[PDB]
Amino acid sequence: MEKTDEYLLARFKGDGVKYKAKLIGIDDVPDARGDKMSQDSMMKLKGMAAAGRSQGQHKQRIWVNISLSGIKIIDEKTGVIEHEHPVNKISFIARDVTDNRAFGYVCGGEGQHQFFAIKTGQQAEPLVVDLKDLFQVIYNVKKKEEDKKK
């Protein structure tokens, strides 16, 4: 129907939503945004993951957890939280037009950007959408609160 702020809040509250996936790789990037920049990284990383696969090396199996806390990359085997990126540290979400089961995002403070390339167990789109809605909700709430303080 309509994903209202309330629905979205209830969805990303606490543990939020969780997706099965694999970590294609991590790459240092020059800027916070950019389709081309993101594509170049994804391509380089997939190139590397491929070379690894031809030698019996597979991508780390993970859980991409999406919530108000941002993104948590969790190891599927140990349950160890490998990475955690607060919403205010994720600057760009990159769609991978060459793959229906891959996407990436840039995170880090200014001047220290990293591209996390992800291979989704299922389709990537529903995941990219969630992230979009998440950023959207966080945004709406903050905006209201502001108009209230004023």
Partner: peptide
């Protein structure tokens, strides 16, 4: 395609 986070930084 790709998109940025309004609340980044």
């Amino acid at each position: 395609n790709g998109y940025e986070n309004p609340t980044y930084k």
